[PDB]
Amino acid sequence: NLAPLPPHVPEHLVFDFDMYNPSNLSAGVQEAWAVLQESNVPDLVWTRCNGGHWIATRGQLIREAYEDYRHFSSECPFIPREAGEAYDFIPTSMDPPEQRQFRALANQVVGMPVVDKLENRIQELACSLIESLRPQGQCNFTEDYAEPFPIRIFMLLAGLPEEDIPHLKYLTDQMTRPDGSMTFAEAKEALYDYLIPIIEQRRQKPGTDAISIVANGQVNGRPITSDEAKRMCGLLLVGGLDTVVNFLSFSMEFLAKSPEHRQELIERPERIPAACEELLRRFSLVADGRILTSDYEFHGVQLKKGDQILLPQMLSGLDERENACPMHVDFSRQKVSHTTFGHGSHLXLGQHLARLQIIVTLKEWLTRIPDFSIAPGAQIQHKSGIVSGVQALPLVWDPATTKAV
Ligand code: HEM
Ligand SMILES: CC1(C)[C@@H]2CC[C@@]1(C)C(=O)C2
Ligand SMILES: [K+]
């Protein structure tokens, strides 16, 4: 239900949006969030859902808030409040100045140089998975590709058993789209329960995996503590297991449904990177936020100290004030404007990994399985949260239309 309105919040700003179960979910998750950008809805509304919080509805406000960490702190970045208070991943839960020393370490485990070195494993895995599926004439896209392809790479990188995937993924999802059986805090603590012994053990006898590197790293010239290492490793796991995994299904769903757009990429493969980018805008999927460090007036609205404000990364590129005809996918879009990977000082650090992962998928999939569709009569269900996703994507094709090598 709906938390009672705080004395400081005027009635005309109330729009009761639930980010975990939005009213128009059936029409598509990006579409359900876009109801916040209809003509009679303010730039800045208060929802009585999920304990009560603000939502900036437009790119300009979202951008401004992300830049202004002095008023909009990451210390409590998740809705509901219990989740933001329990949230303590590094660097995400820290503001500058302290946040920054940690980014460099994180970079050492997921940035460009790590990515260049993983690139042949990544390509190899995409081809392997796709060739395996090709002759079946069908798949459950989420289980058979969108999960194993990003996730086996991350486990490879982190030096963790593939048999640990289901427990890890379960826990991760409880932190972005809870089924209601675990609080944020309960899942985080269970994530820590798993990491703690491994981090110590990798501090005792370091390897060349990501956990060893974080575990034995330095932070602006001094050693990382055990507790900090854990709070960093947890964030990497979440990003490894619940970002690209969901993005791929939005993109594949779209491609299953538009043969023209497939044909465009088959016919002009040089368009793939630009296509990646337009799809990143279109099927944007993250929505975290910040907390007010003081009473502050912002675009003519009075915010109180401790108020939570959701600043949906998803919404900036769907905003018609940033991109005309924003629901329309155009790979030749002259100026693709979005905040898919964030804005300000917390700007995504796995974005090179993610764009490689996307681009490789587009290429290797259309190469082998050019014609394909949604299974007969399947109604694709989406799910909303910190990171939205797709419940299931059953796909079909005629193997005769496909090409191996
Ligand atoms: C489609 C893919 C992805 C999207 C849309 C995405 C989105 C984002 C967003 C919106 C933020 C900012 C959070 C905030 O400002 O509070 C962020 C930060 C971050 N992301 Fe990504 N992400 C993606 C893939 C990945 C991957 C694969 C990783 C690998 C681990 C990753 C690692 C991180 C890390 C470590 C941060 C924290 C940086 C900081 O707080 O300074 N992301 N990401
Ligand atoms: C919003 C995010 C996608 C960003 C990386 C993982 C995530 C869930 C975070 O906790 C920070
Ligand atoms: K916190």
From Swiss-Prot:
Annotated signal sequence range: none
Reactions performed catalytically: 2 reduced [2Fe-2S]-[putidaredoxin] + (1R,4R)-camphor + O2 + 2 H(+) = (1R,4R,5R)-5-hydroxycamphor + 2 oxidized [2Fe-2S]-[putidaredoxin] + H2O
Recorded superkingdom: Bacteria
PROSITE patterns for this protein: CYTOCHROME_P450
Gene3D superfamilies according to UniProt: Cytochrome P450
Cofactor field: heme
Annotated EC: 1.14.15.1
Record has Metal-binding as a keyword: yes
Heme among keywords: yes
Entry-linked Pfam families: p450 (PF00067)
GO CC annotation, single: cytoplasm
Main location: cytoplasm
GO molecular function: camphor 5-monooxygenase activity; heme binding; iron ion binding
Metabolic or biological pathway: Terpene metabolism; (R)-camphor degradation
Keywords, comma-separated and alphabetical: Cytoplasm, Heme, Iron, Metal-binding, Monooxygenase, Oxidoreductase
Compartments, as annotated in UniProt: Cytoplasm
Residues annotated to bind heme: X348
GO BP annotations listed: (+)-camphor catabolic process
Protein family membership: Belongs to the cytochrome P450 family.
Function: Involved in a camphor oxidation system.
PANTHER family found in the cross-reference section: P450, PUTATIVE (EUROFUNG)-RELATED
Protein name from the UniProt record: Camphor 5-monooxygenase
Gene: camC
